[PDB]
Amino acid sequence: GPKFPRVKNWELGSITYDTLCAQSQQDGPCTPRRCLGSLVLPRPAEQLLSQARDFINQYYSSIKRSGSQAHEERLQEVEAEVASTGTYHLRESELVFGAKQAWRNAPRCVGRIQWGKLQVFDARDCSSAQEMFTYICNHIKYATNRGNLRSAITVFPQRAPGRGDFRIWNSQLVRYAGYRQQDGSVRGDPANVEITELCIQHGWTPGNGRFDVLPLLLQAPDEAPELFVLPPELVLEVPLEHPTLEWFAALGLRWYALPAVSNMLLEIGGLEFSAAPFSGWYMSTEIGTRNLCDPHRYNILEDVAVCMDLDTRTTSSLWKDKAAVEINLAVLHSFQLAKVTIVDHHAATVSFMKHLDNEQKARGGCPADWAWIVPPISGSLTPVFHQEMVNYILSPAFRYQPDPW
Amino acid sequence: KFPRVKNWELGSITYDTLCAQSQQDGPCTPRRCLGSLVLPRKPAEQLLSQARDFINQYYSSIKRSGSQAHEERLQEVEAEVASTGTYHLRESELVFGAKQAWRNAPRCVGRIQWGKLQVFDARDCSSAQEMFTYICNHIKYATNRGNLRSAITVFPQRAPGRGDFRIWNSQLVRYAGYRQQDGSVRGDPANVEITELCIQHGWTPGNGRFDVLPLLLQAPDEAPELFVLPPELVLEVPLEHPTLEWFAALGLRWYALPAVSNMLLEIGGLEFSAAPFSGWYMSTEIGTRNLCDPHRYNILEDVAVCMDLDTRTTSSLWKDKAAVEINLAVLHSFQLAKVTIVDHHAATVSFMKHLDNEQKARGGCPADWAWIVPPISGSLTPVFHQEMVNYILSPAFRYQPDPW
Ligand code: HEM
Ligand code: HEM
Ligand SMILES: Cc1ccnc(CCCCCO[C@H]2CNC[C@H]2Cc2cc(C)cc(N)n2)c1
Ligand SMILES: Cc1ccnc(CCCCCO[C@H]2CNC[C@H]2Cc2cc(C)cc(N)n2)c1
Ligand SMILES: C[C@H](O)[C@H](O)[C@H]1CNC2=NC(N)=NC(=O)C2=N1
Ligand SMILES: C[C@H](O)[C@H](O)[C@H]1CNC2=NC(N)=NC(=O)C2=N1
Ligand SMILES: [Zn+2]
Numbered sequence: 001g002p003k004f005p006r007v008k009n010w011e012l013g014s015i016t017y018d019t020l021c022a023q024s025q026q027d028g029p030c031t032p033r034r035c036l037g038s039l040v041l042p043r044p045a046e047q048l049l050s051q052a053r054d055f056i057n058q059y060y061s062s063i064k065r066s067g068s069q070a071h072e073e074r075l076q077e078v079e080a081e082v083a084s085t086g087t088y089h090l091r092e093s094e095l096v097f098g099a100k101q102a103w104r105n106a107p108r109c110v111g112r113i114q115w116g117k118l119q120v121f122d123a124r125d126c127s128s129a130q131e132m133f134t135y136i137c138n139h140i141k142y143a144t145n146r147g148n149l150r151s152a153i154t155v156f157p158q159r160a161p162g163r164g165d166f167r168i169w170n171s172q173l174v175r176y177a178g179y180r181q182q183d184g185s186v187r188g189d190p191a192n193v194e195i196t197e198l199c200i201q202h203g204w205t206p207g208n209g210r211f212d213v214l215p216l217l218l219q220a221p222d223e224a225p226e227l228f229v230l231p232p233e234l235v236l237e238v239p240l241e242h243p244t245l246e247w248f249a250a251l252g253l254r255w256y257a258l259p260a261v262s263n264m265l266l267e268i269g270g271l272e273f274s275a276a277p278f279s280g281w282y283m284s285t286e287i288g289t290r291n292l293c294d295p296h297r298y299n300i301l302e303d304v305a306v307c308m309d310l311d312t313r314t315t316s317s318l319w320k321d322k323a324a325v326e327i328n329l330a331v332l333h334s335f336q337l338a339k340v341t342i343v344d345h346h347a348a349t350v351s352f353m354k355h356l357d358n359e360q361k362a363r364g365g366c367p368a369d370w371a372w373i374v375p376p377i378s379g380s381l382t383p384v385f386h387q388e389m390v391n392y393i394l395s396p397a398f399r400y401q402p403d404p405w
Numbered sequence: 406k407f408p409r410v411k412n413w414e415l416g417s418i419t420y421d422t423l424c425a426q427s428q429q430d431g432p433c434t435p436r437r438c439l440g441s442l443v444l445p446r447k448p449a450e451q452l453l454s455q456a457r458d459f460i461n462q463y464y465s466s467i468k469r470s471g472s473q474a475h476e477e478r479l480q481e482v483e484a485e486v487a488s489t490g491t492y493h494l495r496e497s498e499l500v501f502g503a504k505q506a507w508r509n510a511p512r513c514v515g516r517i518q519w520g521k522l523q524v525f526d527a528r529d530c531s532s533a534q535e536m537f538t539y540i541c542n543h544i545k546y547a548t549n550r551g552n553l554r555s556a557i558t559v560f561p562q563r564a565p566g567r568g569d570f571r572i573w574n575s576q577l578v579r580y581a582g583y584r585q586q587d588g589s590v591r592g593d594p595a596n597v598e599i600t601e602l603c604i605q606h607g608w609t610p611g612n613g614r615f616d617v618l619p620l621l622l623q624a625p626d627e628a629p630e631l632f633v634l635p636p637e638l639v640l641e642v643p644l645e646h647p648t649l650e651w652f653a654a655l656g657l658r659w660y661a662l663p664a665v666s667n668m669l670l671e672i673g674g675l676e677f678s679a680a681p682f683s684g685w686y687m688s689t690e691i692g693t694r695n696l697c698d699p700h701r702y703n704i705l706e707d708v709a710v711c712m713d714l715d716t717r718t719t720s721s722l723w724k725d726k727a728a729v730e731i732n733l734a735v736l737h738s739f740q741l742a743k744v745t746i747v748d749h750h751a752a753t754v755s756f757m758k759h760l761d762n763e764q765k766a767r768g769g770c771p772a773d774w775a776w777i778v779p780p781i782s783g784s785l786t787p788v789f790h791q792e793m794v795n796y797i798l799s800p801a802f803r804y805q806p807d808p809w
Binding site for chain 2: 320
């Protein structure tokens with residue numbers, strides 16, 4: 001065997017070796033003494049140039065002009081520009097390539113079979129919070145496409161020396177309010193308590209429902225963030241019903257169609273895009289298992305079990321598992337009926353297996369975070385449970401970044 | 406740096422300082438994480454410090470850390486190693502080390518029970534025949550007519566000179582898997598290779614789906630010997646469903662006693678190549694993995710059809726629904742048979758309590774998240790939401806090469 005990690009699939013009995021991991025330039029949180037792979041948050045001058053050069057080489061490889069005159073001219077360009085200004089700027093096609101590659105590189109995304117199919121909106125001309133809003137609105141209109149969802153990213157101006165960042169304060173473009181009660185409970189999404197109160201502090205008149213869509217708090221360089229309300233016609237939502245349990249519709253549950261992450265930093269060739277929201281479509285377990293059944297999210301498991309007349313007084317009745325299955329089915333059924341793209345965890349994980357094969361041949365490996373890739377219900381019923389995975393950081397990358405406040 | 410470890414459901418944070426006590430490297434590096442891999446990627450002074458550190462662990466455990474008994478025991482160990490290149494454990498040290506190895510086992514969600522472990526000293530064992538007698542005693546004791554009791558039997562340690570004592574079977578109870586001349590399997594596909602080894606060392610096979618394998622037991626540098634387990638010693642549970650009448654008709658069953666018999670127990674640098682241990686099942690091992698793994702009994706489709714589910718399409722969640730009913734049937738059937746089993750909610754709730762116990766007791770607990778989180782309903786259990794640190798402490802249970 002080679003001195004690259006051996007990766008086994010225990011269902012099929014097949015073996016690969018990950019050589020791509022050698023391309024990692026960035027350390028994760030593990031050491032030989034202890035593994036820290038389960039942590040959610042594993043917390044320039046010449047440094048910039050080498051990252052730039054590496055990225056420029058990656059671009060030229062992908063267009064098969066590596067070593068070419070154009071490749072060598074671009075490198076000189078980059079270093080000349082960095083030499084006189086301290087930074088440099090990407091060509092358009094380099095940005096598109098870098099954005100797809102960041103997605104391709106994202107170890108926590110099971111959706112990566114789709115990585116080559118990404119609409120990249122270039123918004124590097126944006127000069128105000130108002131224009132960020134127009135751009136985001138367009139993104140949302142394009143991406144939503146009346147239920148026939150399309151993966152997209154909008155990229156706003158890069159971080160600059162001593163000038164303020166573009167930031168979207170919201171963690172997603174669509175978030176339901178979380179209202180802290182006098183009794184200490186939360187109405188709405190407890191995930192969004194903090195962003196909800198920031199919105200109120202910045203002048204938003206709050207509602208009082210379980211599903212109030214929040215305004216966007218948008219920040220242009222060195223300015224207070226500005227508040228913007230999404231026209232409700234832009235925000236496609238799906239009311240939830242169950243295919244045979246008629247009373248499920250009476251619960252008044254719903255979810256929005258477009259999962260759009262807005263708090264991550266896109267890093268390309270050492271350049272930092274602090275606002276670069278991206279969207280795809282949901283895997284149904286995200287809604288039906290996590291968002292709805294997490295004890296610290298909507299926490300509806302008991303309510304549903306009571307309605308199904310399950311024995312919630314003992315763990316061994318498996319009342320949680322039964323209720324969770326029906327909530328997931330309701331989500332799938334309801335998105336289907338509504339004609340809103342969604343993928344269940346079996347279809348998603350099967351397609352991620354194909355992705356791993358594609359990447360083994362294309363690049364000799366695929367960075368993957370097992371804990372995230374394996375769905376939160378029915379784990380070993382999906383092929384990825386049985387697949388060993390190697391996790392490592394490649395660039396271009398999406399990274400977590402601190403909250404702006 | 407000592408890792409900060411967060412629980413995301415409750416927002417609580419701890420610090421793991423137990424990991425500093427690790428002496429053995431796992432497979433990860435700063436460049437890449439290998440925590441999802443099933444198998445680990447890969448002189449007298451070295452034995453002496455392992456031995457001394459384990460002796461220190463032992464006298465600390467009984468509060469006699471610094472006593473005459475302690476100092477004199479270190480001299481004994483040192484004298485023995487320097488003269489002979491090895492040493493031996495007192496029975497009480499063996500009992501302390503076996504519990505500690507369980508306690509330290511990162512893949513075990515049942516560690517709340519770690520202090521309750523019956524240790525059989527089988528170190529005065531000199532033949533395969535004698536191993537069989539000890540194993541029969543273990544099974545009878547651990548089984549206890551359905552009221553299962555955790556146990557370990559410890560056979561003689563490895564010695565520089567000779568071959569190891571080994572039990573060839575991966576468990577004391579295993580169902581045969583018979584390969585057909587078209588590659589396909591009848592019985593348990595996990596056991597194809599052990600089944601052939603049995604037939605080949607002379608066993609007369611059955612042709613059923615749940616034929617209990619005999620044991621291949623090996624004394625040092627001898628051919629292994631075959632021993633049929635007496636039927637009455639192997640308690641099995643027929644599987645039925647509380648509401649689905651047809652479920653029984655599937656003819657499914659599972660055995661009561663989970664006893665791992667291929668792992669090595671390392672205490673104080675000494676190695677016990679045969680030290681089978683048993684507890685009781687968590688229902689998902691049977692209901693989810695053993696029965697629904699595509700490379701195991703793979704029954705999901707059969708049950709789905711019987712439930713008249715829409716099998717034409719994944720998005721009806723037919724797999725999820727059949728798996729739930731199968732786990733329910735295991736739980737129901739074990740309860741009906743009065744055989745100890747724990748469901749995955751109750752087990753993971755106990756493990757959270759264990760974490761807290763261990764944080765106070767030791768300042769950490771090594772845990773392999775991928776193993777601890779159950780194979781159905783992961784995020785429905787608290788352990789999903791709990792960050793974990795994985796690392797190797799000694800005493801340990803380890804994997805070892807297969808004897809053939
Ligand atoms: C095409 C439809 C897509 C599906 C079904 C999909 C699926 C998923 C799922 C299930 C997660 C885990 C989310 C969670 O547990 O909260 C995830 C995370 C991730 N996805 Fe994908 N994805 C898709 C498109 C995309 C696109 C277009 C990008 C970027 C261009 C992307 C990059 C990521 C990143 C960076 C994470 C980690 C987010 C974090 O750590 O907060 N995904 N995706
Ligand atoms: C008290 C009842 C017990 C319960 C409910 C329990 C639970 C579990 C579960 C669910 C697993 C993972 C099994 C799998 O996925 O196949 C496991 C693995 C393990 N358990 Fe426990 N356990 C118990 C007793 C014990 C005892 C008595 C020991 C040792 C004395 C032990 C040491 C281990 C070890 C070493 C592994 C890893 C096995 C391997 O890697 O193949 N367990 N146990
Ligand atoms: C593109 C796409 C497709 C499908 N689903 C999505 C939604 C992804 C939401 C991920 C949010 O993750 C949050 C909530 N749970 C762990 C935590 C991890 C995290 C932490 C931080 C500081 C930022 C961030 N983006 N993600 C996005
Ligand atoms: C004490 C107890 C309590 C509850 N369950 C059990 C049974 C545990 C059986 C674990 C067997 O694991 C096998 C089959 N699947 C992954 C694989 C890991 C492994 C590999 C090797 C070479 C040896 C070994 N013991 N374990 C034992
Ligand atoms: C502690 C643990 O890492 C967290 O609960 C992780 C586990 N796996 C996960 N997987 C995915 N896809 N999303 C998560 O939010 C998530 N949470
Ligand atoms: C590849 C991955 O590590 C294996 O499939 C793991 C995942 N988690 C697991 N968890 C448990 N408890 N037993 C397993 O056999 C198991 N298999
Ligand atoms: Zn790791």
